[PDB]
Design a protein around this ligand. Structure first.
Ligand code: KDO
Ligand code: MG
Ligand code: MG
Lengths: 112, 121
């Protein structure tokens, strides 16, 4: 039972500024076999289906803007958005895929 | 164009059953796992389970929260994914998404639109 805790629950920024948010894992998601961290970030714009942002902790998914950066390893992970755009308004879930799959509780990003 | 389409959503009475469908195209179905994820209104995404790819023999896994109650199966001839939900409860009322999964990225890289299930007396 791997528990991912995300912080903050919610935050609000103006367009253009930088935001950071945390994903804390109960267990190391680092895989010796391939030296990969088994954590992914998803963006769910309101009323829309989720979208994969980053996998293996830091690898951006095809098509995803460079303003999203995943970083971290082991049990401590982070998602940074350098230069928030209006498009970025969403809840961001981290998800462990070390053992089956588990989503964190979500970080809701508002822009004003 | 990779596409995933959920269906089977609607009104279900408490205690009952519902089979959800997930039709796909635009990629080699059998090369991927398929996951079911749900999200009750206002709440977090919850991974329900997945069915593996051809290389893994299409075996299945489930979250402890629906293991026993929920069943996942796939139709490789038509590239459709299914979810059989039993003993429906109010807390199962949610949006249900099918998502392409696997050990390539160890993540769900394509998602359907979803179908909503409302469990109402
Ligand atoms: O063992 C794993 O870390 C992993 O999560 C990797 C892949 O996502 C996948 O193989 C999965 C297995 O299929 C178990 O469901 O295991
Ligand atoms: Mg790819
Ligand atoms: Mg713009």
């Amino acid at each position: 039972d791997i528990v991912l805790t995300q912080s903050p629950s919610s935050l609000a920024v103006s367009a253009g500024e930088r935001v950071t948010m945390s994903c804390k894992s109960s267990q190391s998601l680092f895989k010796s076999r391939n030296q990969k961290n088994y954590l992914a970030w998803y963006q769910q714009k309101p009323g829309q289906s989720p979208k994969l942002l980053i996998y293996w902790a830091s690898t951006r998914e095809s098509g995803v803007p460079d303003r999203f950066t995943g970083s971290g390893s082991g049990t401590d992970f982070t998602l940074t958005i350098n230069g928030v755009q209006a498009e970025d308004l969403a809840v961001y879930y981290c998800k462990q895929s070390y053992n089956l799959r588990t989503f964190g509780g979500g970080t809701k990003l508002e822009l004003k | 164009e990779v596409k995933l389409v959920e269906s089977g959503g609607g009104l279900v009475q408490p205690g009952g059953s519902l089979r959800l469908s997930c039709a796909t195209s635009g990629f080699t179905f059998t090369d991927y796992y398929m996951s079911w994820v749900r999200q009750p209104p206002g709440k977090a995404l919850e991974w329900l389970g997945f069915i593996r790819n051809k290389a893994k023999g299409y075996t299945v896994e489930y979250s402890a929260s629906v293991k026993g109650r929920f069943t996942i199966s796939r139709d490789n001839s038509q590239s459709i994914l299914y979810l059989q939900m039993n003993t429906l409860r109010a807390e199962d009322s949610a949006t249900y998404y099918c998502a392409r999964d696997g050990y390539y990225v160890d993540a769900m890289d394509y998602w359907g639109q979803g179908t909503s299930v409302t469990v109402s007396s």
